[PDB]
Design an enzyme around this catalytic site. Structure first.
Site, PDB file in Angstrom:
ATOM      1  N   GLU A   1      69.610 -50.613  12.787  1.00 57.59           N
ATOM      2  CA  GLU A   1      70.530 -49.488  13.012  1.00 57.59           C
ATOM      3  C   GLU A   1      71.899 -49.771  12.405  1.00 57.59           C
ATOM      4  O   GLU A   1      72.516 -48.888  11.807  1.00 57.59           O
ATOM      5  CB  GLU A   1      70.716 -49.177  14.516  1.00 57.59           C
ATOM      6  CG  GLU A   1      69.552 -48.471  15.200  1.00 57.59           C
ATOM      7  CD  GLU A   1      69.258 -47.095  14.648  1.00 57.59           C
ATOM      8  OE1 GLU A   1      70.118 -46.509  13.950  1.00 57.59           O
ATOM      9  OE2 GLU A   1      68.141 -46.606  14.906  1.00 57.59           O
TER      10      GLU A   1
ATOM     11  N   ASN B   1      76.035 -37.799  10.631  1.00 54.67           N
ATOM     12  CA  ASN B   1      74.784 -37.056  10.506  1.00 54.67           C
ATOM     13  C   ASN B   1      75.034 -35.712   9.833  1.00 54.67           C
ATOM     14  O   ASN B   1      76.189 -35.239   9.743  1.00 54.67           O
ATOM     15  CB  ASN B   1      74.122 -36.842  11.876  1.00 54.67           C
ATOM     16  CG  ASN B   1      73.594 -38.138  12.486  1.00 54.67           C
ATOM     17  OD1 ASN B   1      74.116 -38.621  13.491  1.00 54.67           O
ATOM     18  ND2 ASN B   1      72.560 -38.691  11.889  1.00 54.67           N
TER      19      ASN B   1
ATOM     20  N   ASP C   1      74.224 -32.846  10.974  1.00 49.77           N
ATOM     21  CA  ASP C   1      74.639 -31.864  11.959  1.00 49.77           C
ATOM     22  C   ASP C   1      76.106 -32.049  12.360  1.00 49.77           C
ATOM     23  O   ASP C   1      76.621 -31.332  13.224  1.00 49.77           O
ATOM     24  CB  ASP C   1      73.716 -31.922  13.190  1.00 49.77           C
ATOM     25  CG  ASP C   1      73.900 -33.185  14.038  1.00 49.77           C
ATOM     26  OD1 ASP C   1      74.674 -34.089  13.671  1.00 49.77           O
ATOM     27  OD2 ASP C   1      73.260 -33.272  15.108  1.00 49.77           O
TER      28      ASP C   1
ATOM     29  N   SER D   1      77.485 -34.640  13.827  1.00 53.77           N
ATOM     30  CA  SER D   1      77.714 -35.691  14.811  1.00 53.77           C
ATOM     31  C   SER D   1      77.735 -37.026  14.081  1.00 53.77           C
ATOM     32  O   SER D   1      77.398 -37.104  12.899  1.00 53.77           O
ATOM     33  CB  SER D   1      76.649 -35.689  15.906  1.00 53.77           C
ATOM     34  OG  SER D   1      75.380 -35.981  15.367  1.00 53.77           O
TER      35      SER D   1
ATOM     36  N   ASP E   1      76.970 -41.416  14.512  1.00 55.08           N
ATOM     37  CA  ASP E   1      76.389 -42.513  15.283  1.00 55.08           C
ATOM     38  C   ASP E   1      77.360 -43.681  15.298  1.00 55.08           C
ATOM     39  O   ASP E   1      77.960 -44.000  14.271  1.00 55.08           O
ATOM     40  CB  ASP E   1      75.061 -42.955  14.692  1.00 55.08           C
ATOM     41  CG  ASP E   1      74.042 -41.832  14.626  1.00 55.08           C
ATOM     42  OD1 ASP E   1      74.225 -40.803  15.317  1.00 55.08           O
ATOM     43  OD2 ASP E   1      73.055 -41.983  13.872  1.00 55.08           O
TER      44      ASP E   1
ATOM     45  N   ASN F   1      74.558 -41.649  19.252  1.00 54.41           N
ATOM     46  CA  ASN F   1      74.935 -40.370  18.664  1.00 54.41           C
ATOM     47  C   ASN F   1      75.958 -39.554  19.518  1.00 54.41           C
ATOM     48  O   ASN F   1      75.842 -39.449  20.740  1.00 54.41           O
ATOM     49  CB  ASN F   1      73.656 -39.568  18.414  1.00 54.41           C
ATOM     50  CG  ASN F   1      73.926 -38.180  17.922  1.00 54.41           C
ATOM     51  OD1 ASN F   1      74.021 -37.255  18.710  1.00 54.41           O
ATOM     52  ND2 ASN F   1      74.021 -38.017  16.621  1.00 54.41           N
TER      53      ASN F   1
END
EC number: 3.2.1.17
Length: 129
Positions: free
Chosen positions: A35, A46, A48, A50, A52, A59
């Site tokens: 990750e 991201n 959308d 958002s 991380d 998120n």
């Protein structure tokens, strides 16, 4: 902070992750490797909108507030920035709620695609826990 593998394994163990909800410690280390590359400071945006945050790439749409994900939730009730600390406590405590959320570690796409079904125990080999 960039953690060593064994160093992260140990801290994660102290913070109660080993076998948390049935996930051996090797799973948590594997997920963090893929990750964030063991880097508490990692951010990724991201599609959308958002973001991380941190070592387990939690998120902002559901779990933390970063002040720029419209109509998001803050289920861990933390500023997303807290997940970027050299202290992994915030990330671990918030991961505990995520992995309890019903879908287990499948929530972490890199764990699903790169750790799940593999010999995750390799990730804690050689470590003095």
């Amino acid at each position: 902070k960039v953690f060593g593998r064994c160093e992260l394994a140990a801290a994660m163990k102290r913070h109660g992750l080993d076998n948390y909800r049935g996930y051996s410690l090797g799973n948590w280390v594997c997920a963090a490797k893929f990750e964030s590359n063991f880097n508490t400071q990692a951010t990724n945006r991201n599609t959308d909108g958002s973001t991380d945050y941190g070592i387990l790439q939690i998120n902002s749409r559901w779990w933390c507030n970063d002040g720029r994900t419209p109509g998001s939730r803050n289920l861990c009730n933390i500023p997303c920035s807290a997940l970027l600390s050299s202290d992994i406590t915030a990330s671990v405590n918030c991961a505990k709620k995520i992995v309890s959320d019903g879908n287990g570690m499948n929530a972490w796409v890199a764990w699903r695609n790169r750790c799940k079904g593999t010999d995750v125990q390799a990730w804690i080999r050689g470590c003095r826990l």
